Amino acid sequence: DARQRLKEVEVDDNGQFMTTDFGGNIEEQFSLKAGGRGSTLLEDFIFRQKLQHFDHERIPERVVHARGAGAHGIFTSYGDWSNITAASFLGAKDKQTPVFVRFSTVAGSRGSADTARDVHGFATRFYTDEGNFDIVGNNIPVFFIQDAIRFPDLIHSVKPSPDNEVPQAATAHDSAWDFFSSQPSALHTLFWAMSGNGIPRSYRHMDGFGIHTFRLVTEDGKSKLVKWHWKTKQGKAALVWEEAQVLAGKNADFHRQDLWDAIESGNAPSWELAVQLIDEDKAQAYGFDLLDPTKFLPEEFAPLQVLGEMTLNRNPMNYFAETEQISFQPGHIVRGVDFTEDPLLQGRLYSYLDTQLNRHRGPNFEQLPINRPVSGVHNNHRDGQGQAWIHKNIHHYSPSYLNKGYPAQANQTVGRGFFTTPGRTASGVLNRELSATFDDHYTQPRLFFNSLTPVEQQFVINAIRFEASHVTNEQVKKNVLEQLNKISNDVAKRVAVALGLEAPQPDPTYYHNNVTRGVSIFNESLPTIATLRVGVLSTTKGGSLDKAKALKEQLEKDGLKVTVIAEYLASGVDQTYSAADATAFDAVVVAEGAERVFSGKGAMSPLFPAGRPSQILTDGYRWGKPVAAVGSAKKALQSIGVEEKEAGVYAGAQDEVIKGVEEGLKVFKFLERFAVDGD
Amino acid sequence: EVDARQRLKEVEVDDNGQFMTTDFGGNIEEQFSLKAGGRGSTLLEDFIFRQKLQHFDHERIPERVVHARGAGAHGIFTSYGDWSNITAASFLGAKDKQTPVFVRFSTVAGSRGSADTARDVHGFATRFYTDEGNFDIVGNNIPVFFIQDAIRFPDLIHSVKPSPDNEVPQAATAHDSAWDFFSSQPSALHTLFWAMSGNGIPRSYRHMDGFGIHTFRLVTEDGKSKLVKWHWKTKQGKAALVWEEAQVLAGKNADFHRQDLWDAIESGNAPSWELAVQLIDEDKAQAYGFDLLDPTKFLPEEFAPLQVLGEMTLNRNPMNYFAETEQISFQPGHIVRGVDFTEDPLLQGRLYSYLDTQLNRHRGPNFEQLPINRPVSGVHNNHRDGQGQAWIHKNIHHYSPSYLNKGYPAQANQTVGRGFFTTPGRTASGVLNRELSATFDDHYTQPRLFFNSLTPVEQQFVINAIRFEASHVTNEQVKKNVLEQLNKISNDVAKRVAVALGLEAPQPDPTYYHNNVTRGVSIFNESLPTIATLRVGVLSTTKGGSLDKAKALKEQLEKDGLKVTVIAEYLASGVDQTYSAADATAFDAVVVAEGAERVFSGKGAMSPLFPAGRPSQILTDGYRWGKPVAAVGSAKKALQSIGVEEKEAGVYAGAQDEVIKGVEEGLKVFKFLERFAVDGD
Numbered sequence A: 001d002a003r004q005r006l007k008e009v010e011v012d013d014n015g016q017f018m019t020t021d022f023g024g025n026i027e028e029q030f031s032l033k034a035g036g037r038g039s040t041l042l043e044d045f046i047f048r049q050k051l052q053h054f055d056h057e058r059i060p061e062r063v064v065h066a067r068g069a070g071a072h073g074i075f076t077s078y079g080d081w082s083n084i085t086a087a088s089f090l091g092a093k094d095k096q097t098p099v100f101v102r103f104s105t106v107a108g109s110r111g112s113a114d115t116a117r118d119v120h121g122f123a124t125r126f127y128t129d130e131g132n133f134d135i136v137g138n139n140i141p142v143f144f145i146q147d148a149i150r151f152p153d154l155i156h157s158v159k160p161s162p163d164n165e166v167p168q169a170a171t172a173h174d175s176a177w178d179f180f181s182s183q184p185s186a187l188h189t190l191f192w193a194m195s196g197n198g199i200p201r202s203y204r205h206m207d208g209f210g211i212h213t214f215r216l217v218t219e220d221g222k223s224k225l226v227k228w229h230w231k232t233k234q235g236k237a238a239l240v241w242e243e244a245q246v247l248a249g250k251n252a253d254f255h256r257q258d259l260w261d262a263i264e265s266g267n268a269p270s271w272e273l274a275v276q277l278i279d280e281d282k283a284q285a286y287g288f289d290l291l292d293p294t295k296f297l298p299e300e301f302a303p304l305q306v307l308g309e310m311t312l313n314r315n316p317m318n319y320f321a322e323t324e325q326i327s328f329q330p331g332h333i334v335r336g337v338d339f340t341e342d343p344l345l346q347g348r349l350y351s352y353l354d355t356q357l358n359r360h361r362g363p364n365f366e367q368l369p370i371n372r373p374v375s376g377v378h379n380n381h382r383d384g385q386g387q388a389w390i391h392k393n394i395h396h397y398s399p400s401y402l403n404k405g406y407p408a409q410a411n412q413t414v415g416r417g418f419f420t421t422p423g424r425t426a427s428g429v430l431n432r433e434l435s436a437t438f439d440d441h442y443t444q445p446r447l448f449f450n451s452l453t454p455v456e457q458q459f460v461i462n463a464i465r466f467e468a469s470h471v472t473n474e475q476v477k478k479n480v481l482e483q484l485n486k487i488s489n490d491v492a493k494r495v496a497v498a499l500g501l502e503a504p505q506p507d508p509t510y511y512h513n514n515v516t517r518g519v520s521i522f523n524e525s526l527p528t529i530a531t532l533r534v535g536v537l538s539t540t541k542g543g544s545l546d547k548a549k550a551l552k553e554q555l556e557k558d559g560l561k562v563t564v565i566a567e568y569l570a571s572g573v574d575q576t577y578s579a580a581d582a583t584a585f586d587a588v589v590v591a592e593g594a595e596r597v598f599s600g601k602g603a604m605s606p607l608f609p610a611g612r613p614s615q616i617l618t619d620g621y622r623w624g625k626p627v628a629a630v631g632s633a634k635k636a637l638q639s640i641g642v643e644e645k646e647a648g649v650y651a652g653a654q655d656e657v658i659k660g661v662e663e664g665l666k667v668f669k670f671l672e673r674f675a676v677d678g679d
Numbered sequence B: 001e002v003d004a005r006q007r008l009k010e011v012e013v014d015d016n017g018q019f020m021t022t023d024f025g026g027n028i029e030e031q032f033s034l035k036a037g038g039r040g041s042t043l044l045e046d047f048i049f050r051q052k053l054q055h056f057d058h059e060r061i062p063e064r065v066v067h068a069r070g071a072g073a074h075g076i077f078t079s080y081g082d083w084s085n086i087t088a089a090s091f092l093g094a095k096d097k098q099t100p101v102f103v104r105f106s107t108v109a110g111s112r113g114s115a116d117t118a119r120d121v122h123g124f125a126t127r128f129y130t131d132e133g134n135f136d137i138v139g140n141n142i143p144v145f146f147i148q149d150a151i152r153f154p155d156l157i158h159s160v161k162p163s164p165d166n167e168v169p170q171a172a173t174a175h176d177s178a179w180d181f182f183s184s185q186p187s188a189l190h191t192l193f194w195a196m197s198g199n200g201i202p203r204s205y206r207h208m209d210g211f212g213i214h215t216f217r218l219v220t221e222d223g224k225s226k227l228v229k230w231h232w233k234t235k236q237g238k239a240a241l242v243w244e245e246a247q248v249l250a251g252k253n254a255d256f257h258r259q260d261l262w263d264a265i266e267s268g269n270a271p272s273w274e275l276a277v278q279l280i281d282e283d284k285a286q287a288y289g290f291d292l293l294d295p296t297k298f299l300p301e302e303f304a305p306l307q308v309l310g311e312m313t314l315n316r317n318p319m320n321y322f323a324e325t326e327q328i329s330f331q332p333g334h335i336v337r338g339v340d341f342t343e344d345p346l347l348q349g350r351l352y353s354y355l356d357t358q359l360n361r362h363r364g365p366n367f368e369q370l371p372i373n374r375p376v377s378g379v380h381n382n383h384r385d386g387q388g389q390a391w392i393h394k395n396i397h398h399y400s401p402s403y404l405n406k407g408y409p410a411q412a413n414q415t416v417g418r419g420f421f422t423t424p425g426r427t428a429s430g431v432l433n434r435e436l437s438a439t440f441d442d443h444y445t446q447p448r449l450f451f452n453s454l455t456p457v458e459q460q461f462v463i464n465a466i467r468f469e470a471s472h473v474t475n476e477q478v479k480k481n482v483l484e485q486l487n488k489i490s491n492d493v494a495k496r497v498a499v500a501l502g503l504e505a506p507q508p509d510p511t512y513y514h515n516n517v518t519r520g521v522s523i524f525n526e527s528l529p530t531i532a533t534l535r536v537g538v539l540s541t542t543k544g545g546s547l548d549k550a551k552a553l554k555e556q557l558e559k560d561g562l563k564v565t566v567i568a569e570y571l572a573s574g575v576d577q578t579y580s581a582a583d584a585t586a587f588d589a590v591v592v593a594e595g596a597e598r599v600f601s602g603k604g605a606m607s608p609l610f611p612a613g614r615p616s617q618i619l620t621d622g623y624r625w626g627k628p629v630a631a632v633g634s635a636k637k638a639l640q641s642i643g644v645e646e647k648e649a650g651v652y653a654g655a656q657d658e659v660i661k662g663v664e665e666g667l668k669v670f671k672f673l674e675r676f677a678v679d680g681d
């Protein structure tokens, strides 16, 4: 068990009388008053100690990635990688290292919607026997900016307007689009955010990326450039913006519940840890600088090499103490790994340590159960707000005769200490400039777009069309279209149409037809299901419930959790029609003999809002979800204009519906149900 | 005539025409990090980077423990006359006396980023910048609170807020913990009925009635007191959404109420509220069938008519949400001479709590020195030092009594220096105890008086809310416990909810059953006194010259006071919003322009510009949500594609004379309750 180290700090209050924070049994339900109908007394210590705790419960949210969720896990190494890295969690076969991952959005505040369109976070803590190792990544391999100094500018621009604080968890506003049109480096991550990567189905159906180039140092000192990758065993799956908008309102904790449910149900999510190895001498050899966070390395130039697997088997016991309080830092490095001269990475090392003081009100944030390592801490650090420990060592300085030299210095040769790569050199003038090798901002965005399916590319343009239509400034819209035209003239002309402006001037400078693998979401098929969310639209009258229960049993057999929807909570009913919605499910199936409730008199029930069952079916189909009807249920599809056999849509008997709807999920989303330009 | 934000001028910072500087002055370049070479590592000696990033890393302060999600506006309070006969207050001390105000509206369970249109109790908190100190009426949009003793506040909040294990759900009461508390604490049943009604999901902050909840005292110069109940009556009228609309709006626009207020002030149509009071004699505190020290019960208008004292209008929007709205620290303990507290156990514990919490949110005691918190009256006290002391105090003898400071600052009381004083008649009698009065024992009469005072359809919205919320409880015993409590209020309410849950509800308990009705509790009975600031959506098309006909409809409507948005495939000559960007939740009236029927049927519906079947959905949504729908000329085919009658109540068909005047009529009604199914058919 990964949570074993937290068992000593775990409190049970069952079978116990109410006490104050300083001990002693009490009754915290009545205030001390001066008489029967009298004023409350200052001498009521019980009231004050209870309310003081409550009044001071909240800590500041993270400056970015405020909205998110975590889970505990176990990382297992596939073999001894001592040849490539001196890391401890990697230099052994089948070595089990405890982990904790916190996935998140960006612009969104603490209460923002899980299904908002943003870059997603993928922060992973490795509780190594040689210290805490963090890979604070994102679901997109590229970042918006090239210099960390520009981070406040990017965040201030994407986040709500400073005058009214509108909008929440969105980039559809003047300020955000002014920055992208003024900082062309931001164009690659935009294309990724405008794609399926911006609105994924779940945290489990996400690929993770360390973004930066790092170094892997061997015992001897030989280094190799490295790129961290987290490949999902569940496969990449994404929603559609029209679905995503409804889900943000119907269930703002969509991803948060998706993860929680998976772990509890037994189907724990997995990720393979892959790397891209690059020689120090081939840092600019691939047509771009590897110190550039706006560019990613294609799989064709460097194949991915799997090092191990990380699975999340335990959910937290207290969201605050664990998920909210966890303080990640990319500066949480161990012997075997080292930084690169990536200007974005360089500034992050400072920022993450600094911010911790605001969020936690002191320096002992690493003493918190969720942050503390398993390796042990022996240093000269003393005092500070909320000191949890009592240091036996009175000679808290170095060098020293009195402490016989303890704690001792460790480096490369002795005590397995951390060391910077010996080959690393500083050369040239001290300056506040950026390398000329960082000047290309249009080639890489087009490589991604050219590597997506025709309907996927539309989704990218249908996100930009949506977002840009919110810009009130006419000049910002033109500035955006000028930048988009530099990537692709096709992309620019398609967006231009929705905006009412006409500015097509093909600039063939960065135009190319090159395609890269592993960037598409829907192109590959779903491996296991294991997804799942199947909604069964049934009714309380006509014995449809009994037929729906039979479908529920047979479908769950392949490792699923099917929810039966009816007018009220009968014998086999899990959700009602007023509580249920199409956003909650991936597959919508209408049970046999489900009325007359789709268009007849049965549609007008005081139990659910007018025309609800019909809406769940309508929504599913338009969102590309595989829809199904058993026997008589064909009239449900006909009431809106849906043909018997087309894409995912399958009719017939009981077993005839089960087989096919399962195949639909492998495709997940039916792209043929979406209008592409030129038709 | 005057700017309500005049006092914040002193602190405004213009950066137009200025070069980038550090926090300690000096012109700088904050766009490139200092590196050791061309492709080198960043240097620690880069003070520019560190000072820029340090400020950014320390931008966030903790959100409010409750009422985290909300938005404010500056305003001017005007008195209708000289109320010296009823109160010694300065702001009520003269006719047409203008007192600067600042109101913050909010939810409760929702966090900083939560949706504005969620089902919660709404906050309504007013700061009066009196020439006699800051006076706060920290109230809600419901006249009654859930609990009777302030000591139980953490219990109520912990129960309604997200589960501690997973932090699910956000801004909702549809979960085991919240419904276990209501079934275990029957005092919570009145506010529940209010939260389950239209009061729980209002149309806007401007279409809300505000209540001070507690009973207070109004002290005259002489010392004579009168029990009082604060009320804020909206000049805009009470208007509420429907749950099915509210759920879609939370996703489509989570800043719905935040924008609604912002737009109103900018457009010129500033919101107004009349300040009304309920006067009660000290001796008649238990005379009305309930204790007036009870926050779970309200006083009916039939026993005590409302008396208007003045009017408050919000004419100025903030310049910086953080510095103003986020940083404002309200306290019901912000009292002035003329007003006094009552022995209300909920009020008593609030006075402590609100002052305490500021130390967490602001990390020090000088939170009152912040521009938004500072009074206009002037500050003279021996308070010194403290985190972030903004002032240089001139008096070196910071104590009392003192010979050296000549007795300054001097003590003020009732007779000298117009100081605050507690009501002289106020007495303490009896044993010191941890109990509650027997007069607080009734928790079922008042919930039933509210329910009996709602229209038949309104009553269904209460029923359905409970049906929706309770269906989320996973525990079978909690659902039974809830139905047992509901049965104590009304057997009809209990049996209707029971149906949705699958479990029957025994057994009629006629103890607190009555057919009494009270006025001014219904949201949907009375029609809106004005139609301004009401959004209307015009569904038009780029083909067939429909745009030109839509612009004509937009012109005649905008001159009435309404805010008109023309929806089409792309942003043409007169297009404000596209079909992919627009939704029915954004508007109060949905009108289909002549020649727009083309995007309802055939290939017109299948466009790469908007999602499949969008125009139809906006029209479908508007009708099912009870919004007045309209069609000009041939646009009758649009209504026919879903099954809507042109002569139905709320539906308008004809010309660009009949629609324009016919729609604006339906807006006065706001929501057509006839389209909603009631039990018994």
Ligand code: HEM
Residues within 6 Å of the ligand: A061, A062, A063, A064, A065, A068, A102, A103, A104, A120, A121, A122, A123, A136, A137, A138, A143, A148, A149, A151, A210, A211, A212, A293, A326, A327, A328, A344, A347, A348, A351, A352, A355, A356, A359, B053, B057
């Ligand atoms: C490749 C670029 C970046 C990635 C992948 C990234 C990713 C993340 C993630 C995933 C988190 C939240 C971690 C968690 O779940 O607790 C985070 C937090 C944060 N990031 Fe970034 N970040 C990037 C760049 C930056 C930069 C350039 C800065 C500033 C120099 C920065 C400053 C922060 C800060 C201050 C926080 C809050 C952390 C905390 O309160 O613990 N990040 N970042």
Ligand code: HEM
Residues within 6 Å of the ligand: A051, A055, B063, B064, B065, B066, B067, B070, B104, B105, B106, B122, B123, B124, B125, B138, B139, B140, B144, B145, B150, B151, B153, B212, B213, B214, B295, B328, B329, B330, B346, B349, B350, B353, B354, B357, B358, B361
């Ligand atoms: C009639 C009952 C109550 C009403 C009407 C009420 C109303 C409000 C409102 C409207 C706010 C937010 C003010 C703003 O816009 O900034 C607020 C905040 C708060 N309330 Fe209540 N409240 C009530 C009872 C309580 C009780 C019983 C307690 C605890 C004893 C309490 C503790 C707080 C605290 C700690 C905050 C946060 C204030 C801040 O951070 O400035 N409230 N309340």
